Design a protein around this ligand. Sequence first.
Ligand SMILES: OC[C@H]1CC=C[C@@H](O[C@H]2O[C@H](CO)[C@@H](O)[C@H](O)[C@H]2O)[C@@H]1O
Length: 347
Amino acid sequence: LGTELDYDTFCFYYDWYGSEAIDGQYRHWAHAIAPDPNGGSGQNPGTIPGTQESIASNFYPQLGRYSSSDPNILTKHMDMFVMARTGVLALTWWNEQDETEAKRIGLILDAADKKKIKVCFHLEPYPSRNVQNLRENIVKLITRYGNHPAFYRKDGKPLFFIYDSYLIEPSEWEKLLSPGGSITIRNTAYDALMIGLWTSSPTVQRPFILNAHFDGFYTYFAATGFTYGSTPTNWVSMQKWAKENGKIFIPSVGPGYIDTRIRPWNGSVIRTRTDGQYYDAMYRKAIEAGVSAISITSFNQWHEGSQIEPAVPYTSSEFTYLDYENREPDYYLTRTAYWVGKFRESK
Ligand SMILES: OC[C@H]1CC=C[C@@H](O[C@H]2O[C@H](CO)[C@@H](O)[C@H](O)[C@H]2O)[C@@H]1O
């Protein structure tokens, strides 16, 4: 029918939103404003309070200041994934080690399974992250969630994305990811496809990925040109290298970027949506590169204005929000479905 989910399409999902009613605080809708890293000492940038009128986004959610732990919001999000045809929810994971995290992960898996959506984990740069506690955490996540019907596998293996994987030396990664490594996961119950973050130039990233024994790489950033890896004119050559070296390239595409409510000094990274034309151009480049899998930045990174989740026009006494302009609130979901179709036609 051209409506089925695609299980090689990964959409980055954030579960860090709170409401006073459910979480005791409108978590993340309230957010600190970052000081300007070039702007000198004694800045008092303040905070966005997460009131109805003033939230930590340049856009405004159709669903309002929602809780990521509200089962009724989760239902709606899964129906949005079905509309977008995105079969894998790539869940931010911060190793909070608290009952609230454990509850929310279970609720997300349960809601996903009702709609045949799958869940994989996006392993964030949590405090003191290293290959030993990464192994322990991979073991824990596979043990706790690996038998859940919504847990993702690709050809029998779990898949993890590793954000800011460059913060760990290749010599450490080798211990975890080479078949001969001291603490290897290869050939164990806990083996997985490990997808590292390709940032800078090939002279740096090619030996990094090889020496670290990653199974593949992704690029994350929604803003074209932010890094070498997030410059789509490089994607044909990145794919050629991947294929020559037995690696899985999962380029990241997004609909735009803007984070100036929380980073007022970061305007150079703004990428305008142009009624969908930015998203179309980036998704076309991914497909043309001939890749096997695509990642989407993001479902709901509202702070960075990369979300495909529905947004609505809103002007409050405190801020005039951006919105989807000439397009309807669900335009980026239905346009994602269009591109998933073009991607499948290519596979
Ligand atoms: O998921 C990978 C990566 C994507 C974007 C931002 C990163 O989080 C940091 O920035 C946000 C604001 O946009 C903060 O709310 C988080 O606390 C930061 O860690 C995220 O790691």
